[PDB]
Design a protein around this ligand. Structure first.
Ligand code: HEC
Ligand code: HEC
Ligand code: HEC
Ligand code: HEC
Ligand code: HEC
Ligand code: HEC
Ligand code: HEC
Ligand code: HEC
Ligand code: HEC
Ligand code: HEC
Ligand SMILES: O=S([O-])[O-]
Ligand SMILES: O=S([O-])[O-]
Ligand SMILES: O=S([O-])[O-]
Ligand SMILES: [Ca+2]
Ligand SMILES: [Ca+2]
Ligand SMILES: [Ca+2]
Ligand SMILES: [Ca+2]
Lengths: 441, 441
């Protein structure tokens, strides 16, 4: 069965083990709502409007899902707003339970449930078939420990077991680094890849099944949320197209002291080891590549803010149209535009690596998002007119996260206090039960 | 001393002379307004709404400016819609005239004035200091024969005379393959590069001097026209950033029958000699690089059309607001938006090579265009409402060039009749006068 206790592997594999543990150095947790308060409006009614940080080291996955406001402060195993599926991409204990109880049995019930079962840091069994006798010998034996990922990979015509070593490499990361949704009453993780991985494929896919992630509480639009589409966007970009794998840049072959070759498990910023990553294929100075990348980053940033500003006006303008007496049939075509505009925006920048992995596709999707936002705001102006409104809709102060959160009716003081008490008192009980059950060293 | 009679150099320089002359093989003249009737509406009130074709071989430069509807049917040297400056990038006689009469004397007057003076095909003295003794020996002796280009290069901190061989290679192309405007009552060519070559730099530059190319007959917006900014956009793109020169792809070094190395002067599509072009730096095969380029071309085209459709609507809605009583002060803010939107769009796709030279910059520009086009149509929906118009403005059928042109008031048959007559009777008289005067063998 799966060995979720990572430290079990330290003596046999010092080089991988030590460099894997070192992601605990990537510890800064940057508040992205604070940096961009518009996110709060666009995600109004959804948990991302309460708390959304930039990623950090794999070592912090378990603690971050515990600590994010998104998972709240459940007082028992059937409480809290979120289901078991929130653990899915955070811990090899997921592979353990999936193997122990079956996939269906793993996904059943609330996040709170897994509290005392999912306790080991994202680790060896997530990516490796550790039970294989070859793993002991120092062979990677890569595997997809997540059945939902195995299925998604077949669905794009790339079954894992039939793929070469190098395709498999990126697929391992594509177990988590993807856009997904919770399918069914049991909220199983599903990748919406049935029709392809492009924004248009997914848009039409989500529309066919009339899926919606939540209802924007300002405009009452049935929204889609995107998440960190690295696999999909990497596939579209020029590096992907040339089979430069996630590993080529994020997990370089390096030497130990006795000169032995090993894969660097300290997954982080490839530029921190330029000599072993880009320099491997590129003759350019580090500073020159960093500057090209910084420039795409700013290009996308500037454009992304313009689309967001439009979407902010659209949400508040739809709120106005609702208050002035707009009926459901009158809102519908506006709401379709907003749903679409925002999906395209969200998928365009939900991956923080887009300006590197596929800057041109990032840019393209934003442009198509603007086209729909224009359609939404044009329709809205005409709808407001029919209700006797011909002036610009005024927008409350959203210059800080705090003001944006207050403006959509969040009681943060209370939301935060309830989470702090959950963190202090519940987490140690969970860890104490896990140790008792032999789950946690 | 400037020799505009190109055949003089044939004996001494058979390899360059023969391939140069060969651009005459690239003879298809594809009508771009026919491919895309939307352009007719965007350019309403401007010669481009009459006639605009995709580029062909250098060999046809003199014929094309003569034959385009944009230059009209002048019956004498003072007549015609357009000025001397239209010759500036079509013939080495321009260098002859500028050296002989000076830059101001070259620019003074009407395009008609030049008919019997500007008669040799784009050629040697455009790019080469042919007077140099080192030139007879087979050394390129590249030069900027166009002084307004020399000033423009100096303006962006790349003075021709201080530049290496490879900077200079693209600079000779940057004498013509640039965005430009006509400066002063005499209409001298100027590259709007003073504040930089980014779309934002030129928009600010143009707004700073309140410049307008023309007024859109539909919306009465003061408009900017973009023209083929290959130098600016090649600069912004990844190749340009690595000093891959226009020459590396469009003018490869080849070998003559006797194994002698020379520059291929047949300037055309680099894919036609992949082995000598791209294969020099890339290991990917021809079909694979072609399909990447074809993808980017499709991406941009899709976004392009979305932006153009918004702009078309913007112009007809502005027309309707005008027909419905809107004042100048009411229109001003709307016209600013349209002005900026279409400038950003026009500079993004005025280069037919943008999908290859700098896909990501093309796409980034179309996104920013979409942003102002959205503000414009939102402003217009409100203004229209204040005149009691709350329905969508209907657009005439513009599915073909012929119907678009008809819709903006053009009398295409008359325009064509006048142009045909002018080509049949006037051109020959020009050529005869130039022979008479030894300017044309
Ligand atoms: C199928 C993969 C997957 C699932 C399911 C998933 N995550 Fe994530 N999560 C990721 C990846 C990949 C990152 C880091 C990349 C990023 O944030 O862009 C991440 C980052 C995070 C972070 C740290 C950054 C932040 O947003 O503050 C938190 C907290 C988090 N997830 C909570 C959750 C919650 C709550 C759920 C249940 C709704 C969930 N995750 C479900 C893959 C997943
Ligand atoms: C998040 C993904 C991921 C996790 C977590 C992970 N591995 Fe790896 N591992 C990889 C990939 C990818 C390779 C490279 C396989 C190849 O070269 O084809 C690799 C390589 C290896 C190898 C083969 C030798 C080498 O260095 O190339 C060993 C042994 C190994 N890892 C051990 C571990 C141990 C022990 C852990 C837990 C401490 C761990 N791995 C966690 C993805 C992961
Ligand atoms: C089992 C789920 C899982 C898998 C497998 C996985 N990731 Fe992650 N990854 C995450 C989560 C969750 C985060 C965010 C951690 C946090 O913020 O606490 C993350 C973060 C990251 C980061 C941010 C590091 C930092 O310090 O900012 C990078 C880079 C990254 N992953 C790359 C990869 C690569 C490359 C692979 C493939 C070898 C991979 N990941 C495989 C879940 C996963
Ligand atoms: C060819 C190089 C390259 C490849 C291929 C690549 N990465 Fe990246 N990635 C980078 C670089 C460099 C950055 C940081 C960009 C920057 O510093 O602005 C990054 C950023 C990221 C981030 C966000 C990091 C953060 O801390 O915000 C994640 C997550 C990520 N990559 C995951 C992946 C995954 C998953 C794959 C495979 C599907 C992949 N990368 C393939 C080079 C690469
Ligand atoms: C294992 C090979 C490999 C690695 C590693 C690699 N590159 Fe690339 N890079 C390529 C290939 C292949 C291309 C496609 C063009 C070509 O054929 O050279 C490319 C293209 C690029 C481009 C031009 C595409 C664009 O974005 O406009 C940039 C920039 C770039 N790489 C930067 C980086 C950076 C930064 C890193 C490290 C973070 C990196 N590369 C690592 C092989 C690699
Ligand atoms: C002095 C003016 C001038 C300069 C110098 C010049 N161009 Fe041209 N170029 C033109 C004009 C005008 C056309 C369109 C000709 C026509 O349609 O008759 C053109 C057309 C082209 C085309 C389209 C050819 C086809 O068959 O479709 C290419 C490619 C091109 N130029 C590249 C270059 C390159 C590379 C350089 C630098 C070596 C260069 N040009 C220098 C003015 C110039
Ligand atoms: C500063 C350089 C420059 C000047 C000034 C210039 N052109 Fe051009 N012209 C070019 C280049 C470069 C091309 C080919 C690139 C393209 O068409 O996209 C071209 C193409 C053309 C063509 C063939 C393609 C078409 O559009 O039908 C015509 C005709 C033409 N120009 C007419 C004119 C007229 C009329 C003027 C004066 C209003 C003018 N040119 C001024 C550089 C110039
Ligand atoms: C790295 C390769 C590369 C370099 C560098 C390059 N070109 Fe291009 N260019 C191309 C290719 C390939 C095409 C045609 C794209 C296609 O086939 O769809 C093209 C298209 C063009 C076109 C439009 C041709 C047409 O018929 O529509 C012009 C004009 C042009 N290039 C001129 C230039 C100029 C001027 C420079 C220097 C400023 C330059 N090129 C540098 C590869 C290059
Ligand atoms: C529109 C630009 C342009 C035109 C027109 C042009 N040349 Fe060139 N020529 C170049 C460039 C660029 C080179 C390459 C210089 C280098 O390799 O640095 C070159 C190279 C040459 C060389 C040097 C040897 C070689 O082949 O590399 C000679 C001689 C030459 N051309 C002759 C001519 C002749 C004769 C004509 C008229 C028949 C002509 N050129 C027209 C731009 C031009
Ligand atoms: C004189 C050298 C040179 C030649 C010739 C050349 N390239 Fe490149 N190309 C580069 C360099 C350098 C990069 C940047 C990435 C890297 O460092 O390899 C690049 C990057 C690229 C990229 C990745 C950027 C992107 O758009 O995503 C593509 C695609 C590409 N080249 C296509 C072509 C094509 C097509 C041709 C000929 C039609 C060509 N190249 C000719 C040197 C060259
Ligand atoms: O919420 S998870 O997808 O980062
Ligand atoms: O980042 S290091 O390779 O210079
Ligand atoms: O009209 S000319 O600039 O292509
Ligand atoms: Ca980070
Ligand atoms: Ca989703
Ligand atoms: Ca052509
Ligand atoms: Ca212009």
């Amino acid at each position: 069965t799966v060995e979720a206790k990572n430290e079990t592997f330290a003596p046999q594999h010092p080089d991988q083990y030590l460099s894997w543990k070192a992601t605990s150095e990537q510890s800064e947790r940057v508040d992205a709502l604070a940096e961009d308060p518009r996110l709060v409006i666009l995600w109004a009614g959804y948990p991302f409007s309460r708390d959304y940080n930039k990623p950090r080291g794999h070592a912090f996955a378990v603690t971050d899902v515990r600590e994010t406001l998104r998972t709240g402060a459940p007082k028992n195993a059937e409480d809290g707003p979120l289901p078991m599926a929130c653990w899915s991409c955070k811990s090899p204990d997921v592979a353990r339970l999936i193997q122990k109880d079956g996939e269906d049995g793993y996904f059943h019930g609330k996040w709170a449930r897994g509290g005392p079962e999912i306790v080991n840091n994202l680790g060896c069994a997530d990516c490796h078939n550790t039970a294989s006798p070859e793993f002991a010998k120092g062979k990677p034996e890569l595997t997809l420990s997540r059945p939902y990922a195995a299925r998604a990979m077949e669905a794009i015509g790339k079954p894992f077991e039939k793929a070469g070593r190098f395709d498999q490499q990126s697929m391992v990361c594509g177990q988590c680094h993807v856009e997904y949704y919770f399918d069914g009453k049991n909220k199983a993780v599903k990748f919406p890849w049935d029709d392809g991985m492009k924004v248009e494929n997914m848009e039409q896919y989500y529309d066919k099944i009339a899926f919606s992630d939540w209802t924007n509480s300002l405009s009452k639009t049935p929204m889609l949320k995107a998440q960190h589409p690295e696999y999909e966007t990497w596939t579209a970009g020029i590096h992907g197209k040339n089979n430069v794998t996630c590993i080529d840049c994020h997990m370089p072959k390096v030497q130990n002291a006795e000169g032995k070759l090993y894969t660097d498990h300290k997954i982080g910023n490839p530029f921190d080891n330029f000599a072993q990553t880009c320099a491997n294929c590129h003759t350019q100075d580090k500073a020159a590549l960093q500057k090209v990348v910084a420039e795409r980053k700013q290009s996308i940033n500037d454009l992304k803010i313009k689309v967001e500003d439009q979407l902010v006006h659209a949400h508040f303008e739809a709120k106005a149209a609702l208050d002035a007496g707009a009926t459901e049939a009158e809102m519908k075509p506006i709401q379709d535009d907003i749903r679409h505009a925002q999906w395209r925006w969200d998928l365009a920048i939900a991956s923080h690596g887009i300006h590197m992995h596929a800057p041109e596709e990032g840019l393209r999707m934003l442009g198509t998002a603007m086209d729909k936002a224009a359609d939404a705001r044009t329709k809205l102006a005409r709808l407001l007119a029919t209700k006797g409104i011909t002036h610009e809709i005024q927008i409350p102060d959203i210059s800080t996260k705090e003001k944006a959160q207050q403006a959509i009716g969040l009681n943060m003081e209370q939301i935060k206090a309830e989470k702090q008490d959950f963190i202090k008192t519940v987490i140690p009980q969970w860890e104490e039960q896990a140790r008792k059950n032999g789950l946690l060293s």
